[PDB]
Amino acid sequence: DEDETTALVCDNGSGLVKAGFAGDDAPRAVFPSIVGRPRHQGVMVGMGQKDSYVGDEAQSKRGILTLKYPIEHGIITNWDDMEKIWHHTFYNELRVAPEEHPTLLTEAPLNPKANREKMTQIMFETFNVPAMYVAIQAVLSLYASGRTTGIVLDSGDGVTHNVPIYEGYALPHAIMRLDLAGRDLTDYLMKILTERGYSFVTTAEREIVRDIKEKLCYVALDFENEMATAASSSSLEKSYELPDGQVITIGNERFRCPETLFQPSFIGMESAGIHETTYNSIMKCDIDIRKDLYANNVMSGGTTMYPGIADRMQKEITALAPSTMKIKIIAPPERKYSVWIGGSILASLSTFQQMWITKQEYDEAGPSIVHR
């Protein structure tokens, strides 16, 4: 129990932090990855002067603060502001003292060696956690779907990745990163919806375009004769009621937004798209392992939640793969937390105890120890 209860799992994202206790089924804490700094001197009624704001209080009060994102494209870019988000996570969100909890953290696919050593330096030397561990994100997603070999298409708020994993070892030279994700996708909907003849003028109009994207957006299979369908004008249309009455209608654009993930050309991107990239990762891997990867395309991440994403991907890679092959696109329902759940499982596991980096290992080996 000492640490059975006690292991923490913190998944640091570009848009959201997911956090909680190893053992739980889902994150106890989910909140924006921002750190707000007040543009002016003054106070809220009853509070003192605050130097900084994190998560939702930074989002809610955004009009008087300069908002900053510590993680650009999955990589920690500002370490002063990240130690601020961690502090908030332990002390306010989970309300635990960190110096008696083992902490499993996550990093990104080709996270620079030096960063994995730096967050270890900050975990052990400024938070004084007993022990910690850094798992790679795609690797926890795979594992949370039971398996050990497969290829994960991972897509969240600032990055998309393909991480081919074989008997647990993520394959460095076959990993692909595509910098277009849910953030890019909300801003494109924004324009095709103002372009539908609308105005997201106040900040209460801006924010909810993102809630339109999440609730009403679709990834149609045969996106071709779906536009064609749009035109005959079926009961395909969908009206959403705004903060007030102002019933906005979205028929068609509803799927023009996730067609951006297959066609980056919709947004002036010259890069290849999700399905081709799944494939290219795969023809960059060893030959003998390619049947395995093809029958185990595990999807994880908030942006892979658009319904019919899996069917489109299913047919997208069948028709690029040699017919002798078995294609299989696994997309679980909890996928917006796969990464986290894979960490919860792993860290609560009976056999993981012997991989925890302890302060004994650290004080004796330097940050190098956990770096592997």
Binding site: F21, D24, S141, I341, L349, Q353
Partner: protein, 494 residues
């Protein structure tokens, strides 16, 4: 047993370890299941039979008549009351006393639950709502809801809840899993409830712990359960070896002899670390349990790659002799145990159909409802596919507790002045005044008896306790030896 300040009784405290869940569902040919079942069907309290909706013929309950049904030396009828009456004294509510019974019959019924293959499908479909009905009612459930959950287990892979279909073989097995699960829990509860009554307000200054557990037994077939027990014993042993080392060393200090020696426990630390330490057996065991697609075989390899050749107490089996297969031997104080790793992963996961548990959790039978609470409160933690059950307070290992409990125990054992008792079994044949040799010999090694003799003989074999020394030999210089023994229990012998 918590004694008071004066020295008069004040409280008690029970704790249970490793219950034979399998009896509930199985039984060897010359054996039988728990008594209760046979007690109840004895018919001393006929209401019970009608109340539970059963018969008096055990051959109607597969789960409990696979072996034997009657034992000449036991009067199921008398016991039933003993039992009955005990419940009462124990302060249980009639209702609870009713849950217990009703709940103990449901379990019988489960084993009667039958299923059939849906046509053209490989799915399981209920083969009738005769029994389910009873099981359902007895548990404060709904027949249907129950049979669905059972047949169409509605899971939660990803961030949702995905309805999964099961096979005939899968159901029969899940049922059995609940049957066992339920029985267990209940048993645990009863204990707690007992403990609850056994709780008084009066002050407590000290206690006397009475530990009853099994000893290191070696079988041609050693599975998971054996490891757990052996491990317990190898610990207990070290516990002694030390107490003795401590103890011994006092004499040589009291007398003034000049003897230096290392803790006798130390000899065993090797084996213990290999099991309980971080990259040790259990861990590798409890980690793999987190891998959604691991195999016993998988686990096995992990076991080797990491301990084989690098660890001395670790060895690859000797497949032949009286043994049944190969996986890994360990070098315990008592000897080499050949362990078979097959089922471990599972056994260790305690897989239970959560849909059903759901139903329990909202039963009309409070008690049943209760027993499940702790499962219902950790689900938060393992919301999506993959991951860690512990996040919400759910067990991650079959072994994760065992250890926790075994620690809480060995700790309680320390703040204690250990007093040892070794029970022996003369002859397999049940004959007074007789003894098979090698049979007793065995016990002696695994007992600790032969190890205590060893440590004794290191050396100065025979060691006389002072009073035991006075009495028997005073007579030798009668005047001067008696004076010595009487004048100072120790100084005397001197």
């Amino acid at each position: 047993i918590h004694f008071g300040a004066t020295g008069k009784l004040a409280s008690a405290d029970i704790e249970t370890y490793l219950l034979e869940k399998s009896r509930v569902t199985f039984q060897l040919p010359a054996e039988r299941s728990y008594h209760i079942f046979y007690q109840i069907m004895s018919n001393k309290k006929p209401e019970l039979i009608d109340m539970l909706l059963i018969t008096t013929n055990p051959y109607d309950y597969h789960y409990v008549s696979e072996g034997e049904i009657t034992v000449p030396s036991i009067d199921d009828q008398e016991e039933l009351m003993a039992t009955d009456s005990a419940i009462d004294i124990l302060g249980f509510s009639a209702d609870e006393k009713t849950a217990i019974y009703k709940l103990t019959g449901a379990v019988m019924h489960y084993g009667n639950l039958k299923f059939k293959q849906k046509q053209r499908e490989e799915q399981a479909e209920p083969d009738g709502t005769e029994v389910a009905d009873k099981a359902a009612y007895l548990m404060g459930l709904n027949s249907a809801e129950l049979l669905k959950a059972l047949c169409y287990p509605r899971v939660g892979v990803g961030n949702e809840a995905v309805t999964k279909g099961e096979t005939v073989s899968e159901v029969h097995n899940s049922v059995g899993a609940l049957a066992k699960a339920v029985y267990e829990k209940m048993f645990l509860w009863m204990v707690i409830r007992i403990n609850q009554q056994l709780d008084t307000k009066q002050p407590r200054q000290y206690f006397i712990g009475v530990l009853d557990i099994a000893g290191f037994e070696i079988f041609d077939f050693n599975s998971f359960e054996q490891l757990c027990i052996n491990f317990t014993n190898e610990k207990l042993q070290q516990f002694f070896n030390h107490h003795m080392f401590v103890l011994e060393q006092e004499e040589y200090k009291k007398e003034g002899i000049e003897w230096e020696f290392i803790d006798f426990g130390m000899d065993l630390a090797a084996c213990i670390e290999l099991i309980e330490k971080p990259m040790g057996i259990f861990s590798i065991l409890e980690e793999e349990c987190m891998f959604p697609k691991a195999t016993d075989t998988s686990f096995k390899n992990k076991l080797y790659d990491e301990h084989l050749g690098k660890s001395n107490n670790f060895q690859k089996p000797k497949p032949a002799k009286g043994k049944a297969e190969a996986h890994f031997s360990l070098v315990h104080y008592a000897g080499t145990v050949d362990y078979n790793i097959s089922g471990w992963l599972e056994k260790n996961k305690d897989p239970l159909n959560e849909t059903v548990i759901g139903l329990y959790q909202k039963s009309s039978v409070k008690t049943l409802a209760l027993l499940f609470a702790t499962y219902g409160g950790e689900a938060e933690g393992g919301g999506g596919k993959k991951g860690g059950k512990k996040k919400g307070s759910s067990f991650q290992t079959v072994s994760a507790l065992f250890r926790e409990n075994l620690n809480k125990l060995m700790a309680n054992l320390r703040s204690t002045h250990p007093h040892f008792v070794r029970c022996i079994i003369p002859n397999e044949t049940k004959t007074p005044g007789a003894m098979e040799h090698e049979l007793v010999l065995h016990q002696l090694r695994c007992n600790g008896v032969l190890e205590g003799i060893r440590i004794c003989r290191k050396g100065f074999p025979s060691r006389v306790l002072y009073a035991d020394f006075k009495q028997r030999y005073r007579v030798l210089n009668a005047s001067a030896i008696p004076e010595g023994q009487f004048m100072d229990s120790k100084k005397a012998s001197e």
